[PDB]
Amino acid sequence: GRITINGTSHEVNLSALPADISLNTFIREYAGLTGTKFMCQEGGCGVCVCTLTGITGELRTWAVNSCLTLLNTCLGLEVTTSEGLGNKRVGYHAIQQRLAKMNGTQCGYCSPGIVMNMYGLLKSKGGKVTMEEVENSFGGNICRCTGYRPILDAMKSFAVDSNIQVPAECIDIEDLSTCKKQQPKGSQLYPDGSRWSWPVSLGDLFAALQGAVKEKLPYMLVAGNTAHGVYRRSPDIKAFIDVSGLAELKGHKLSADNSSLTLGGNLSLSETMELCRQLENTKGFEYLSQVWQHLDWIANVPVRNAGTLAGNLSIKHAHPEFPSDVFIVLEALDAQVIVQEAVDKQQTVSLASYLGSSMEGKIIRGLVLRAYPKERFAFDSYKIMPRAQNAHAYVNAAFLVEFTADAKVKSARICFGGIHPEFVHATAIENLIRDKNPFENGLVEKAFGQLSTLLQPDAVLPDASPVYRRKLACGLFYKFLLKIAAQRKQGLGSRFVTGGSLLKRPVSSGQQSFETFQEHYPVTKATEKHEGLIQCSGEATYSNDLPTQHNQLWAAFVIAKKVGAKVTKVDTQPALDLPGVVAYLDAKDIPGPNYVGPKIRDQFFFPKDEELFATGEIKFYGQPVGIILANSNSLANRAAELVKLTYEGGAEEILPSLKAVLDKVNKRLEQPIKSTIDVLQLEEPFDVSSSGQLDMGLQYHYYMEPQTTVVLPFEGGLQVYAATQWMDLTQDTIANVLNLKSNDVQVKTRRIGGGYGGKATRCNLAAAAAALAAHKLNRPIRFVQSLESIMTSLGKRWAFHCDYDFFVQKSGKISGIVSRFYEDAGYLANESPIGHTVLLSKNCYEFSDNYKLDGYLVCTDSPSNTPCRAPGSVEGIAMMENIIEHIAFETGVDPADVRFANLLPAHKMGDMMPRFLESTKYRERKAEAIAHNKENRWHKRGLGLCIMEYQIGYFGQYPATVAIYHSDGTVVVSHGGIEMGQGMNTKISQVAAHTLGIPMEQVRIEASDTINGANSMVTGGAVGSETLCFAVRKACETLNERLKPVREEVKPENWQDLIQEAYNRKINLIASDQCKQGDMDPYSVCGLCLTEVELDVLTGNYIVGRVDILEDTGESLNPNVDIGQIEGAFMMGLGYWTSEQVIADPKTGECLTNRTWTYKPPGAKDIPTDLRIELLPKSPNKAGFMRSKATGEPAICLSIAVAFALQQALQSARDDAGVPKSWVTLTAPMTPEHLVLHSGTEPSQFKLN
Amino acid sequence: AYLDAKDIPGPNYVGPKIRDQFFFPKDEELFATGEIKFYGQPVGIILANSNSLANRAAELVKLTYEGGAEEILPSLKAVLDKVGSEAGNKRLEQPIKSTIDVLQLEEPFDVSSSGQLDMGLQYHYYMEPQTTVVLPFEGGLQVYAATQWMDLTQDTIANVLNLKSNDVQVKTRRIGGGYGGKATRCNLAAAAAALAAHKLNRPIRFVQSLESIMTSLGKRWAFHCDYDFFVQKSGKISGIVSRFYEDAGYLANESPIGHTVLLSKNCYEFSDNYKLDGYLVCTDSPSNTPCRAPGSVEGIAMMENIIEHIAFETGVDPADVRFANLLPAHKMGDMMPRFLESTKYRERKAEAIAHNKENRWHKRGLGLCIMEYQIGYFGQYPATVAIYHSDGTVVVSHGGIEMGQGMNTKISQVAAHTLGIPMEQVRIEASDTINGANSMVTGGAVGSETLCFAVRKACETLNERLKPVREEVKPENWQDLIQEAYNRKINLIASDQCKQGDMDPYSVCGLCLTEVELDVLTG
C-alpha cells in the first residue's frame, strides 16, 4: 500500500487502517499535516480541499474534498496540500502570497482549502483561466469572514484577462502549462470482514462483483464516494470495489455518422463538462452547451471532479425522491443506459427501464445520447436554487421540443424534479401541444392552468412550500416558451420579453476609499494580516491541530429526541459492541454540579441553570444526555447514534419556534421592557396610519472551525486546547464540574476559526464533556462537534417578531409609534439581546413622548439561543428602519425623504446622508429602477437605503504582557484577547511597534492562555481589538519609561544597542498591564448602505448589483482590517436577509436545517457585483482609542438594505399583478420562495402578447 | 540525513550574538571545520527514525583525515610535563599574577616545607542526559531544552539559524539535575537539533548517549597546586607561596580561577604574606565547564590542604593549626569550639591513634575541614504571578529553572506567606522565554532565593492592589476578596524581577568531621 503526499512517499499498511478511512483522516492523523481542515464532512464547505495528480499518458491534477475521497482509491496518486506549495523557510507559493498580501484571509480556516482549489483549477487548465472562470470555481469554498471580494481579487489576478492591481512585492507563479495509479491484484481483507478490490479490467470487476454477491456481502462500486455527502453510506457495506481505474468505464465514442454519443458510466461530471465543450461545435450536439450549463449548476468543482454520472444515477435508483439534475437532463434527452451484467452480457435500455429494474450484480457501462440538430430541436433546462451555487434545487426541469417545417410540435419531453417522487413528465401538456404551433392563439394560456392543476407537489420538511414549487414549475415552462419565442423570432409583447432571459451577473468587483496618516505609522497603515501567510500555507495551528496524543479518544453527544419526556433507561450495548468504542459517560459521572457556567453567576449570561447532561424533562430535541468515547471521530459519531434511550411520557404540545409559542397566546413569556406610556395619547394630528409586522428567524453562526476542545491529563491536572472566545469561563466551568483547582486547569487558545458570538459560551458543553472524559478515563480526549451536533443541540441568533402601528403626517414625519416585539430565547432566558434592541430602537430619529415600546422574552422548545454578530443591535435597527420604509410606502414619500423628515437635529447623519445620496447618484438611480419596472413585467429593479447609529460601549478587563528580547530587540506579546479572524493581532502589532518606535515585523503575538490571560473577559462587543491595543500601548509606555534613562545616558545609535545596554543595566524588559471599562469613553458609529437588486419575478431569484457602504471608522487603525470587517459583517447580514433559513420540525422540535445540504450562507457569487466601501474622511473620534472606531459589528445592521431593495422589486410585481397597493411583512430571510409567494403571480398572467 | 557545517545558515558558533569576557571570550564551533581540537569533537549529526539507529549510523559515517598533531596533550599533567610550569607557551595563560614578585617574611618561622595538591576532572552525572526536542511551529521553533539558561539556548539557536529571537520559544518545565553541566554544554545538542528541525521541517529529538556526553563535553576543571609554607612551632603561618594551574580543555571559556582566588585565604589571617599565582592551561580535551561550586572547591581544598600539611610537619593537631590561624572575632571562632566539643573530636581523635598503634592492616582516620564560602548575586530573574478569580488559586511562571534544588518548593512557601494563603493553593508552571524572557542562568546557589525575591515582590504588588478592596468590603475569606477584586477590575496579574544589588552578599561558615576505616591490604 503506497501514497505520495507533497513529494514524499508513505508506505500504507492497509490491514491496520479502517476499510473506509477518508483521505482527510489519513492526511491529518497519519501524515500529520494539519493544514487540510474539516468541518461539514459532506463536500459542502471546502475547508478539506486538496489536489490529486495521476496519469493520453499525461499528468492531470484536480481538486477533491479530502472528507469524501476514500484513501484506498488514492493509492499511487500524488496528494498536494497547502504545506506542499510553500512554507516560511523555502518561500511561500504565488497563490499563498497573493491571498495574504491582497487581504483575503481573516480567521484563516478556509484559506488552505481556497489555495488548493485555485492550484487545482490552474493546473487542470495548464495555467490559463479567465476572471469569469476563476469567479465560477469557488462554489464549494464557504468563507464566513471576508465577504469573498478580496479572495476573488487575489485569485482573479492569475487570469490571462486579469484587470486586478497586484501589490509589487507579490512573486510570479511558476509555469503550470502541460505518479501512476496503484492497482494491487485480488482483494485485501480487513479484521471486520471488509474487502477492497482494485479491478483493472471488466473481467476483474465482474470477478470481484460476482464474488461479493455469492458470499452475500453488501457491495459498493467506489468512484468519488460523493453520494455519502447526500445520503450517508450504510455501515453494512463490506465489499469496496474501486471503479475509478477502469478505462472501459471512462472515455466516449461519437458514432460514425455523428448520430449518437456514448459516455462512460464513470466519467466524472468535470470530464463530461470538458467533453461537452469539445463536441458543442459538432452539428447535432450544439445542445451539449446546455448540458454543460446544467452540469455547471451541480454541486461544486471538487465534487464534480470526483463524482460520476453512474454514481449520481445510482442515487436516483436507490432514492426515487432524489431530484437528480443528471436524471432530469438525461430523461428530457431520452438518454439510453448500457446495463452490463458480465464481460459479454449487456442490454441498452431507457433511463426509465434502468430505474424500474434491479441493479444487483449489474453496472452502468455507459449512457447513449442521440444528435438533436439546432433548429429542429429546442433543448433547455433549469435548476432553481436558494443561492448562486452548491445548493440542491427547489425545482429542476428539462424541456426538449421537436419542431416540424411549418413551426408545429412533432414531440415534447417536459420533465420536472422537486414535485413528488413519482412525477417526471408533464404528460397532459406534451399531448396538448403535440401537432400544434405553441404560439397560436390561446394555447399557452390553456397549457398553464392545465400544468398548474396537474402539479400536486408533496410537503416533506425541510423542502419549500408546495405552492411555491407549483408556481415555480409553471414559471419555468413559461420562461422556456418566452426564450424559444425570442430565438425563433415569434412576436412577444415588449413587457414580457425579458421573462425569457436569465439575470445578467457580470464579473464582480470592489472599490475601497480610505485615508492613511504616515505621521501615525505603523498605525493607520493598511497591512496584510499578522498571521496571513501562516493561515494560507497551513502552518497556522488551531485547537484540533494539536498532534496525535497516545491513547487519545474522540467524543460525541448522545441526544434525547422526546421533548417533555424523561429518559428512564439507557442501553449502551449496541455502541460498546463496535470494536474501538471505549465508554459512555452521563450526569452520574459528574463529580461537581451538573452545571455549564462559573462558580459565581451574574444576571446577563448565567441567570438560569443549564445542565451539561439532561437528568429531568428533555427541554429540546437534541439535548445531550451523555457522550460516547471511541478511537476515531467517525466511530464516536456512529456509536453515539446507536445508544438506545427509553423515554417515559412526553409533552402533548411541542412549541419549538417563536411562531408556535405566539400563535398559542403564560410562563414562556416575560416582559423585561415595559413602556412608561400605557396607551399612546397622540395629541398631535396625523394624516396616515397603518399597522405592520417584521419577522426575522434564527441565524447559525457558521464558523468554519467547528466547536472543538482537546483535553490532555497532565501532571495531575488538565491542559485544555479550546476554541473559545472566553478562556476564563472555559476554565471556571471545567474546574467547577470536576471539583478541581483552576490553577490545575490550564487553557490555551492561540486562535479560533471564527466565533461571531457562538464560541462565547456554547463551546463549553463540548469543553466540559471532553474534560470530564479526560479526567475519568485518564487519557487525551478530542471533541470536534459534527455540524449536525452543533446545529441540532446548540443555539443561534435569537429570532425576532415585531407588531407595530404608526401615525405620520403626509411628509412621513412621525406623530406616534406603538411597537411590541418578541425575541426567541430558546428554552433558557440566558444572554438576552433585548437591551441592545431597545438601545437602537430610535436609530437617528426624533421622538417626543410618542414612541410606546414593549418587549418580551419568549422561551421555545429549542436549544438555548446565544449572541451572534451584533446581538439586539440588528433587530433594533431593523425594527426602526422597517417602520421608516413602511411609512414611505403608505405616504408615497421617497424613503430618503421620510428619513430627512425624522432625523435628529445637529446630528452627524445630517452631514453624512446628503453627501452619500450625492456621491451614490441615489435620485437618478431610484428614478431609473422605477422607469425600468414600468417597461418590464418579469424582471424588476429595487434600490434599498439603510442608515444607522450603532452604539459602542466597553466592559470587563483585558491583560497584556510585552517582553523585549535583549538578543535582537524583537518583541513578544501574550494577552487575554482571542484572535478569531478580526485582526486584533494585526492592530496590536501596529500599536506595540508605533509605541516602542520599531518595525511591525519585529513584533510577534503568542498564544492566549490562563497565565498572561488570567481572568480576561470574553472577546466580543466589537471593542476587543481597541481594548487589547489600549492594554499593549500601556505596557509598552512602561517599557519606554524604563528605557528613557538608558537612552539619555548612552545615546544609542539603534534599537539593538539601546536594548543590550538596558540588559547590561538589568532593566526589566517585561511589562504586564491591562485595559478595563472606563479607560476609554464610549461612542457611536454612523453608517449608510444603498443596495441595488434585479428580481426574476418568475423564479424568485435575484442578483445583488451595486452596494455602497459609508461608515465612520474614525481614523482607522488599519483600513485593510476595517474594510474586511465591514465586508464580512455586511455579507453575514446579506445571508440573514437572503438564503439562510432555519426550519424546526413542528411535531418533534428537531432543527431540520442541520448541515450544509440544508443550510446556505453566502457563496462567492452571492455577493454584490459592485461593492464600494468608503471609510468617512476627516472624522477623528474624540472618544475610544487613537481617534479610531470599531468595525467588527456595525455593518451587519445595514444588510436589511438588501431586503428593502427586494421589497421595491416585489411591490412593482404586485402592482403589475393588480394586487391593491399593500405592505408585505419584511422577513429574514427574503428567499426566492418568499418573493414568488407574495408577488401576486398567477399562471393566467403568463401571456406572449 | 547527515548535516554538518555546510548546512549552517548563520555563524558556526555556539553562544550569543553579543559575547562577554567570562562565558564567551573564545570562538567555539557547533561543527568542527579545520584542525580537530580534541577526540570526540562533533563534525556533524545523523538523523534516523530511532535513537538506537541514529547512534549506530553515527559510527558508520566514514571520515578521511589529513595530517595530525605532532603530540596530543589531553590532560593538565601532559601539558605541564611537555611545556614546563613556566609561561613562555600559547597553552599557558596567567590571569592571576600576585602583586608580590617574591615572598619576603616579616615574621620568623621554625618549619618550612613544599607540597602539591592534584584534583582531576569530575563528570556532572546528571541523571537526565543532555536533551533537546525541537518542533517546527508556525514558521518558527518550539524548543524543549534541558537547560539552566533558556535565554542562551534561544540566543544561540536564533543566531546559528538566522531567526528572530521571538520565533524561537524555549520551554523548560524542569531538568533532571544540572550542577552547572547544563548552563552552556546543552547548546551543542540544542543547536544541532534545531538546525535539523529547521532544515528538514520535522520534529527532532536529541537525547545524547552517556558516551557522547563524556567523550565530547567538558567537566569540572582539573586543578594542580605547587606550594611552599613557612610556619611557627604553633602552626601559625608566617608565609605561603602557591602556584596553581586549572585545566580549561581546548578553550579558555568559563574560567573558575576568580573563585579559587576568592576562597584561597579561607577564614585564616594573612599580612601581605600570601604569594598566589594562578594559571589557565589549554589541553587537547573537551572545553571544561562549571560543576557544583566551581573554583570554590579548589580554593578551599588549596588552603585546607596547606593546614593539614602544616599539622603533619609541626606535629600539631589539625584543629590546633586552625586555631593558631583563625581571623580574630570571626564567626568560625564561635562555631569551631562548640563543634569540636559536641562531636567529641579530642576523644575520637585519640581513640583513632590508639586503635592504629594496635593494628597493622586496619587503620582509622579522622578528617576536619572548615570553610567560609562566599555567596554573591548576578543578573536579573523575572517572575509572573496570577490569582484566579474563580477560586483564589495562584499560578507562577518565572525565569528560574527547577533542577531538583527545591526552588519551586521555596517559591510556593514565599508566595503563600506573602499573599496569606495555604501553600497547597500555589502552582508553579513551566519556565519559558515569555514570562522568563532574558532571565540569567540558574546557578551560584542563589537561584532559589533570587526567584523568591522576584515572586515576593510580585505578590506585594498584588496585596497593594487588594488593600483598598479589603478595607472597603471587609471580606470573610480570600475567595470573597478575590471575586470582589475581579468585580472592580483589579488586575490580579503582576510581573516583576530580582536583579543584582536587590539583596546584600554574605558568607556561609561550615565545618565537617569525617571518620574512616582503611583496609591497608586492599585500599
Ligand SMILES: Cc1cc2nc3c(=O)[nH]c(=O)nc-3n(C[C@H](O)[C@H](O)[C@H](O)COP(=O)(O)OP(=O)(O)OC[C@H]3O[C@@H](n4cnc5c(N)ncnc54)[C@H](O)[C@@H]3O)c2cc1C
Ligand atoms: C455537496 C454535494 C452537492 C451535490 N449537489 C448535487 C446536485 O445539485 N444535483 C445532483 O443531481 N447531484 C448532486 N450531488 C450528487 C453527486 O452528483 C453525486 O454524489 C455523484 O455524482 C456520485 O458519483 P460518485 O462517483 O461520487 O459515486 P460513489 O459515491 O462512489 O458511488 C455511489 C453509488 O453508485 C454506485 N456505482 C458507481 N459506479 C457505478 C456503475 N458504473 N454502475 C452502477 N452503480 C455504480 C455505487 O455502488 C454506489 O452505490 C451532490 C453531491 C454533493 C456531495
Ligand SMILES: Nc1nc2c(c(=O)[nH]1)N[C@H]1C(S)=C(S)[C@@H](COP(=O)(O)O)O[C@H]1N2
Ligand atoms: N473574522 C472574524 N471577524 C469577526 C468575528 C469572527 O469570529 N471572525 N466576530 C465578530 C464579533 S461577533 C465580534 S464581537 C468581534 C470580536 O472582535 P473585536 O471585539 O476585537 O472586534 O469581531 C467580529 N468580527
Ligand SMILES: Nc1nc2c(c(=O)[nH]1)N[C@H]1C(S)=C(S)[C@@H](COP(=O)(O)O)O[C@H]1N2
Ligand atoms: N537537586 C539538585 N540540586 C542542585 C543542583 C542540581 O542540578 N540538582 N545544582 C547545584 C548547583 S551547581 C547550583 S548553582 C544550584 C542551582 O539552584 P539554586 O542556585 O537555586 O540553589 O543548586 C545546586 N543544587
Ligand code: MOS
Ligand atoms: O460580541 Mo460578538 O462575539 S456576538
Ligand code: MOS
Ligand atoms: O553555578 Mo552551579 O550551575 S556550577
Ligand code: FES
Ligand atoms: S469538510 Fe470536506 S467539504 Fe466540508
Ligand code: FES
Ligand atoms: S477567513 Fe474564510 S472562513 Fe474565516
